[PDB]
Ligand binder design. Sequence first.
Ligand SMILES: CCCCCCCCCCC(CCCCCCCCCC)(CO[C@H]1O[C@@H](CO)[C@H](O[C@@H]2O[C@@H](CO)[C@H](O)[C@@H](O)[C@@H]2O)[C@@H](O)[C@@H]1O)CO[C@H]1O[C@@H](CO)[C@H](O[C@@H]2O[C@@H](CO)[C@H](O)[C@@H](O)[C@@H]2O)[C@@H](O)[C@H]1O
Ligand SMILES: CCCCC/C=C/C/C=C\CCCCCCCC(=O)O[C@H](COC(=O)CCCCCCCCCCCCCCC)COP(=O)([O-])OCC[N+](C)(C)C
Ligand SMILES: CCCCCCCCCCCCCCCCCC(=O)OC[C@H](COP(=O)(O)OCCN)OC(=O)CCCCCCCCCCCCCCCCC
Lengths: 481, 86, 90, 172, 75, 469
Amino acid sequence: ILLSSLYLFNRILAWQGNVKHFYLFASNLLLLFIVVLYINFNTFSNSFQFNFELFNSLNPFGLSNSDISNGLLFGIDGLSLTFILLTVLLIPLTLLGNWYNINFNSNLYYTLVLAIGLVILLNFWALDYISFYILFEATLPLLFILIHIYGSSDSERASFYVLMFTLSGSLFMLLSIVVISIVLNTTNFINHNLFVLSLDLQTIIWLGLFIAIMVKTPLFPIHVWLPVVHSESPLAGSMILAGLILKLALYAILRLLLPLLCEAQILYTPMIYIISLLTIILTSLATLRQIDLKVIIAYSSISHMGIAILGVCSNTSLGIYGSIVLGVAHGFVSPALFLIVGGILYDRYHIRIVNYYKGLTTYMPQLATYIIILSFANIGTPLTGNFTGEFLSLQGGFIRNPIIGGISCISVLLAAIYQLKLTNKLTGGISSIYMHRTNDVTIREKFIMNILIISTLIIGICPQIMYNLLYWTVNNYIYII
Amino acid sequence: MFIGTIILVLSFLGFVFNRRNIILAFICLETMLLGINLILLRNSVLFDDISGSLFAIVIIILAGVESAIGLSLLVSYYRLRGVINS
Amino acid sequence: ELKPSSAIQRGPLNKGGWDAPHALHNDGAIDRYAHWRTFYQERFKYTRATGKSTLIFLVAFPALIGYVAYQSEGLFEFAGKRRGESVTTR
Amino acid sequence: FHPYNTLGLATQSAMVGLGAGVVAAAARNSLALTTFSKSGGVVTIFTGASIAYVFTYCSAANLRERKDGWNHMWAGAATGAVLGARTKLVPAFIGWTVLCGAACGLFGWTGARFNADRKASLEQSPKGFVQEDAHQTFWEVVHRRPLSLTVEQLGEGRGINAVPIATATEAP
Amino acid sequence: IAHHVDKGSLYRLGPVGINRLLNKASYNVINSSLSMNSMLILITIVSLLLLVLVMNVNFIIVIPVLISILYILFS
Amino acid sequence: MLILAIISLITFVSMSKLSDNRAIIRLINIYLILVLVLDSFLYLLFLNNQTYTVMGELLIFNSFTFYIDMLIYFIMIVISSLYGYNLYNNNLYKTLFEPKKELIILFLINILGALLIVHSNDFITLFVAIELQSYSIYLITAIYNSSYKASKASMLYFFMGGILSILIAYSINTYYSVLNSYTLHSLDSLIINTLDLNLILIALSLGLLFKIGIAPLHKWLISIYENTPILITIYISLIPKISILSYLVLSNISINSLVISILAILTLLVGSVGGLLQIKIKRLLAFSGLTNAGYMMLLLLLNNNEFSYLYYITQYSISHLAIFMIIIFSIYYINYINNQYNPIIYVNQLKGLIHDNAYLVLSMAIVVFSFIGIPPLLGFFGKLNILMSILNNGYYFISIVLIVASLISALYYLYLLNVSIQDKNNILINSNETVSSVLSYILSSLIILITFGFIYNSLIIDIFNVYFN
Ligand SMILES: CCCCCCCCCCC(CCCCCCCCCC)(CO[C@H]1O[C@@H](CO)[C@H](O[C@@H]2O[C@@H](CO)[C@H](O)[C@@H](O)[C@@H]2O)[C@@H](O)[C@@H]1O)CO[C@H]1O[C@@H](CO)[C@H](O[C@@H]2O[C@@H](CO)[C@H](O)[C@@H](O)[C@@H]2O)[C@@H](O)[C@H]1O
Ligand SMILES: CCCCC/C=C/C/C=C\CCCCCCCC(=O)O[C@H](COC(=O)CCCCCCCCCCCCCCC)COP(=O)([O-])OCC[N+](C)(C)C
Ligand SMILES: CCCCCCCCCCCCCCCCCC(=O)OC[C@H](COP(=O)(O)OCCN)OC(=O)CCCCCCCCCCCCCCCCC
């Protein structure tokens, strides 16, 4: 199979010359395969189901059935399945959004994009700390290369930011993982809630883990790399980064931190709430005085992640469900806004300064409708998944701490301010003098945006449709005596 | 222990604070080896032990070959420049 | 006498592609304003106003929220509280 | 905790710093009476750093009646203040203060040692799962901890109660 | 906020401040191929001996000396 | 085999003409390969961690030294291939890379010195092996006497090595004067408790460590590495590090040493910070070597460091060989040869290499990200094992400093890739010339090892548990 499929790949490359059709086909097959897996997934059980092990000593190149397990573990539960489905949904759209604007070394570009997508998808399958960390860092070289070669004018500094900040956080994560390894001599996620470390040791390990979470989510005050890396990334890099790599952080909290360091998490929760309220308020305010389109869209994601964090550390089932739903809805909506600003407007006019843009409704009414819909979705209109996520997250946060959650309810207003201030200038007024008329949104762009819009609407009208995968998870991590 | 130690330390200070010539440098190397060996041999005698004297003989031979190689290096260095201005 | 091999033939790096008509009329003033705003960090200096905003937002505001969040931890329980009952636990 | 003798220890530190600055000045001279003329004030650098660090460390340790990393944080802050006064600029002074204080606070937190405290380290400590009902030590792990320990360490409230809810709310 | 905090202080404790700090420190550590190196080796030997003497006396007293030494070398 | 090779080679090189140098070197390359493959089965002696004292208790043989020995042979094979084969067949490369007549004999003798350092059970053997390696490495530095910088380098090296050798001999003799012995095997826990040997043993360790260039005595070695011919630097920067570090690890005479702790910290800081402002390739690589030597120095503070040290030294040897070979290959695409000993000198001379050779830059990226420690490349697991060891033994502050130093050094590691994936105006159109098959295959083998070594991690640890326990 693998030999034959490799032959097929080689022949397609030799004859056609551009791998991108093969990659699109492949990613669609992967999506279908994951859907088949969902069909055969038992939901009346809190146990990992499609388990396999790699690089075991008895079978380094195959799967292990040995009675000693020294390789890397993989498997899924409902929580991993949700994000995996999101990933396989997003990857083909990431390939498709750059279908025409890459005219050089295109095969390498598509290879990097598909590789990053596969790395994240595999990362969600990881079942122990070491493999999780391995696949968690494996993206950074690919992101560095991609941003450096296929990025905009300031792409060199962008690539250095995206590598350095994430390494900086990941190495403290590595300290915590090394401490866990040498203290427990185990690394798995299957039974790691069974080990009850001393409170002081929990308090120490929690620091490294949460520093990694601060850099990767990001949270205030170490969020300054994200707006850059977004603004100078090419479209696929921005869509992947906004839609999957940030959710890797939330998945990291739920999988690595909460089951193992429960008591220390209980001790540290108000500090988390300080940091999340900081990120929400301060980044939302800082968004008001930006002049770049992609930078503003990037700043939106940080605030939504702040609300997600407030949900996920609320020690309530509603808070956790809200954090997950908000993560999924953000993965639907933010790639769409990035598609607009960095693939439609940027590919037509090759500029991102806000002053140039005005009154796009006259020549491009369809693009204006899309902007309006996506912006009201981003600020949390009900019947959109974003609203369900923000509402449930805020419920959990208000329960966990009434004052802090009540103040956090100002995020609704702040989000409306920056987003609608942007869309007001973009859609209306008299058509700009600086730019000329160009085509309206095309069939491909409309297809991608329709996919994202219908996904967010579907989970916004009936968020319950996710519950069958998540009803174990909403109880697996809350710590009430 | 006394004569050897003082030869070692004075040759070391001559080497370090040399700002006169490179020959002084060679000589400080040799005299350091001398002082090391004198300390060694006094200890050999005090212990009535042969291991000390065996290592002294080996130092002698290795200092010989080290001097040979070092002077060869200096000559090869000179061949290109014609003059040693230190 | 040390020169690269004569065997090598070097041509131009052309990037190919179709030169689209230029659909934006760049405004030099806007570009300079954008560049100044984009690289403001290269020229930032600590003064009285800048230091004041720093000490407010990075120090005073976090301290306020921390005092609130550690003082109020576990203070409230609201679920189904009735008349006469204390909504406070301490 | 029995006190550090701040005065004496600071005096010895003054002596050590003066000697170290003298050695640095002699070196500086050799590498470049003029030795102190062309010193660059290194003798003052050493002397001031020594006095500041030692005096602030002992002072803070005595006042708080504790020995931990916070004392090193204060002492590093004082040392950074001394070293950043040389810039003659308020931002640089503040930066030296806060950052040297942070670095030395990290140093004091890890143990205020460059090598390791061998007896406390994991390799020389009781580890693994504990036996029948023994008290938990720092490196040891269990399957269940005593609920009274949870209630005392974490504190009452926010879902931490002496008795499981369902048991407490059972009818008879 | 957006300027003074985000592109101000956070970049100070970020890419820009670190860039300046590393520029200065690196310049200082790079700032007579023999005589100099010989002086270096003597200075290392004597400095190590005196530092360890101090450590035997009292380890707390040597911390400022190490801080000052690093200040000389990097700054 | 090594002694027999040295003797025969002296005879042949005496009786052969200057044109036969490369053929002779190919002969020895194949001979070493044959020895490595046919005599490998002697590992079986070391089953259950069986130790053997040999030559009247002068040499010690265990699994550890057997592995170091095999590694040194592999390194010698790779290094001799660079001299035994031409990259290109043009006049320029005949001028650039020609092997001296006696170079191979010097290489073999320095290898013998390194192996005797590794196996040394007695201080007399240690000192003789140190002096053998030191003399051979002086001469290797000096054999390219047409270079002004190489001769200046050899002289500075002679003097610094002589002083450090005198410090070492002094330490050996003080140990003799206190214990009337020349063996560390005479040492025991009772003896270490009873007597204060700390000063003597630390002086011996420092005398050995300053010979591989740990701070604050680095700069003389970085200058030597900068000023030697590039194919000489590939060797002299590696073998002494391996031999000295392996001896120190095996001896374990500085456990929990406060002075070694402070010096390892200082070495990390200087290697990371000082390499940032560098613009020359080989100075960048030498500061890389300094930082990695710091990572290995940390392992001298603890017991049971065999696995972490072996893994780290192996992956470092592979990465170091590979990065030097990549710099060597990238010479064919530069438009300016600086001189005949060091054809490429400045990092910026690689600018736009991806447009000339995409896969060369792919290999460069792989090796750089190994150095930074990106999983699942080998570099990550090397750093992981080191962190495991030092955290198990309570070196908390040193672990924090190691984190910080890896972060800082990532900057000047990525400097190379950064300039390499930028764009050059004059892009290779075509060429008839083929890079030599053999060296390209070797470079590819190193790259594939770095990339896909991790699949064998669990098998390696299983083997290790039976040969080192
Ligand atoms: C992610 C951010 C990283 C930054 C944080 C790292 C800092 C770690 C600090 C925590 C920690 C090592 C923990 C390492 C765990 C993994 C390491 C994590 C990764 C490493 C990067 C260092 O604890 C240090 O704290 C300093 C104060 O701050 C002290 O400074 C000094 O104070 C003065 C000297 O007395 C001087 O005046 C001066 O010398 C300094 O002032 C040190 O003495 C002290 O060793 C604590 O270790 C130790 O804790 C104790 C009781 O906790 C344990 O023994 C316990 O004994 C009973 C009670 O004792 C308990 O009944 C029992 O149950 C338990 O057996 C020990 O077994 C040991 O384990
Ligand atoms: C037909 C004979 C050919 C054998 C030639 C060997 C040449 C060595 C040259 C370079 C060293 C390169 C890599 C050494 C591998 C370690 C072997 C071992 O397992 O390491 C163990 C000890 O683990 C350790 O400490 C850690 C070792 C650190 C290795 C770091 C790299 C890991 C990734 C390498 C993956 C291997 C590539 C396979 C691709 C299909 C020693 O094993 P051992 O002493 O029992 O000897 C093995 C039996 N032998 C003699 C017949 C071969
Ligand atoms: C470079 C970064 C670091 C690299 C570290 C790890 C690299 C791993 C390389 C990818 C290989 C993993 C994917 C293939 C493994 C699974 C093969 C398999 O057969 O699944 C095993 C599992 C159980 O099957 P079984 O027990 O045999 O019973 C069958 C009953 N009919 O059967 C199942 O339940 C199906 C399992 C589906 C798994 C989905 C995997 C998602 C992505 C697949 C390709 C990913 C390739 C990644 C490439 C980039 C590198 C990360």
